[PDB]
Design a binder for this molecule. Sequence first.
Ligand SMILES: O=C1Nc2c(ccc(Cl)c2Cl)/C1=N/O
Ligand SMILES: [Ca+2]
Ligand SMILES: [Ca+2]
Lengths: 95, 146
Amino acid sequence: GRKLELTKAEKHFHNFMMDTQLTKRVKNAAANVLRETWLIYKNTKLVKKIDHAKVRKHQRKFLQAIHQLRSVKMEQRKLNDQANTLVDLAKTQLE
Amino acid sequence: AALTEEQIAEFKEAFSLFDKDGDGTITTKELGTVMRSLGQNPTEAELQDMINEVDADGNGTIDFPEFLTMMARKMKDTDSEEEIREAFRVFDKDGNGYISAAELRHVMTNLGEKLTDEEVDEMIREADIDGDGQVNYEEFVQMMTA
Ligand SMILES: O=C1Nc2c(ccc(Cl)c2Cl)/C1=N/O
Ligand SMILES: [Ca+2]
Ligand SMILES: [Ca+2]
């Protein structure tokens, strides 16, 4: 039988977005990653006059959006393993 | 994502592990119960999200058709050798890839669900391949997963 094998974990974002709330979280945080990447680039590379306070504001907004994205990714990883736990328990009835 | 008919009858028996009342649907309440009996603590939102990933019709609960259907999307397995080796490393104090037989007996008879000293004997008979009172657990795990 299966011996010591367990369900293989999945690959990418291609699931669990049916929870529109994570979807709302992903789409807002990713727009903000785009937003603050642009504004940091502009305020450091497309100006003669680097306004450090402006860069600080957008660095704080940037780290916020990145870690929001990280946080959604870890909750997807957690949901998949919770699901793989049920699939693994079910699968012991094949023994 | 398409498997055998024998497994259909098998997954039906699995379904009763989940349908704690036998009403033909899995609710979040029963899924919380089952998940907690496996040593996990999912939030109410995590339970609603697992049901909603399966829930074909939208009635908030999983039936065997929806249960069987998501089983096929998750049929592939992978070997567990590296995960088992890291469980052994937890007890590798020196980080040298060894755990003494005495240390292994102490762990197996004091932590988790435990083993009898007789059960531990058989285990160490197999684990100490070189008979030197030290378990090279990567070797021992490769022997058990081969
Ligand atoms: O995205 C998934 N949702 C799932 C999976 C596997 C099993 C179960 Cl019960 C659910 Cl609700 C998934 N595998 O990717
Ligand atoms: Ca039920
Ligand atoms: Ca249903």
